[PDB]
């Protein structure tokens, strides 16, 4: 079976602007490869094709792409989920970020927002434990749905609020992360964290568009975490 692709190209030393290039791949009829498999095979035939990938199993977060309009990971999106008779499979970089080369975007702004929310345990050291901090299963369950983020940026690059203000709005991934520390029973700086999130932009740019939760390859829900931060902000400042 012949597979047809339309893939975004851009090299600043060669291209005036980005363009779309047609590609073709012969595939095995009775076998369903992942998009990443196809990309790797395209690069065997066009070595100039640049994209990021590593784990190939949906864990590292390297190969976020816009595939037929929708964000996801190449390594766990089957060709069969993308392929339509008479249509090309359209592969483009995550939206809103600068394009370095071909399918490779500069994740700088995404990482900057993550750093803004101080994503590390802050514990004042008072009442230190004998060994590990004791965290009951009930307290530990609160981190579930939050710690699993793989920093793929599929969510944020699908968020319009993040498109218009990537430097001010923290964006879904970053807010999910802030929340992961906000409700960690071991983190003692909840109040001071919330006090850094009270401005008009950090959190409140989220208008429940819900693009974030439809694309997350890990099935996480930034909208819900954001909702929780907003409650905490009301509880503290209203």
């Amino acid at each position: 079976m012949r597979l047809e692709f339309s893939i975004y190209r851009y090299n600043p030393d060669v291209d005036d602007a980005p363009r779309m290039q047609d590609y073709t791949l012969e595939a095995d009829e009775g076998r369903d490869m992942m998009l990443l498999d196809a990309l790797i095979q395209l690069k065997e035939k066009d070595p100039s094709l640049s994209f990021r990938r590593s784990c190939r199993e949906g864990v590292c977060g390297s190969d976020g792409l816009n595939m037929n309009g929708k964000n996801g990971l190449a390594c766990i999106t089957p060709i069969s989920a993308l392929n339509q008779p008479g249509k090309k499979i359209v592969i483009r970089p995550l939206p809103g970020l600068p394009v370095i080369r071909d399918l490779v975007v500069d994740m700088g702004q995404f990482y900057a927002q993550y750093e803004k929310i101080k994503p590390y345990l802050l514990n004042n050291g008072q009442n230190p434990p004998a060994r590990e901090h004791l965290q009951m299963p009930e307290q530990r369950e609160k981190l579930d749905g939050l710690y699993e983020c793989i920093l793929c940026a599929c969510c944020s690059t699908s968020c319009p609020s993040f498109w218009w203000n990537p430097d001010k709005f923290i964006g879904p991934a970053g807010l999910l992360a802030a929340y992961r520390f906000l409700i960690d029973s071991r983190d003692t700086e909840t109040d001071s964290r919330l006090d850094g999130l009270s401005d008009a932009f950090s959190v409140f740019r989220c208008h429940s568009i819900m693009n974030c939760v439809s694309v997350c390859p890990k099935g996480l829900n930034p909208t819900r975490a954001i909702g929780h931060i907003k409650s905490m902000l009301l509880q503290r400042n209203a």
Partner: protein, 105 residues
């Protein structure tokens, strides 16, 4: 700050929801819309106050909402500030025109 805006939008939305129910309620049960019954309805102190209250609530609610729109789509500072000026003036003019209109009934 963000929490203040967030709360004000919702506080004024509740007030405006009640106003709409009041107004729709009038329109859906008034029957024959004569000048007499129309001026009767806006003569009422209840209608005058509620209407002006609504206009203040619009000023708050729409200002915060338009400010959010502008801070997404209008980056150049001078154009944004000028547009905010037009919008705030329009909202204030709304309230003021309202007073002039109800005072006159």
């Amino acid at each position: 700050n963000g929490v203040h805006d967030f709360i004000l939008v919702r506080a004024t939305a509740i007030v405006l929801t009640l106003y709409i129910i009041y107004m729709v309620g009038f329109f859906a049960t008034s029957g024959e819309l004569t000048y007499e019954v129309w001026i009767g309805f806006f003569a009422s102190a209840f209608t005058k106050v509620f209407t002006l209250l609504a206009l203040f609530s619009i000023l708050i609610h729409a200002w915060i909402g338009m400010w959010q729109v502008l801070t997404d789509y209008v980056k150049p500072l001078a154009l944004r500030l000028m547009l905010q000026l037009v919008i705030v003036v329009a909202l204030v003019v709304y309230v003021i025109y309202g007073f002039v209109v109800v005072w006159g009934v």
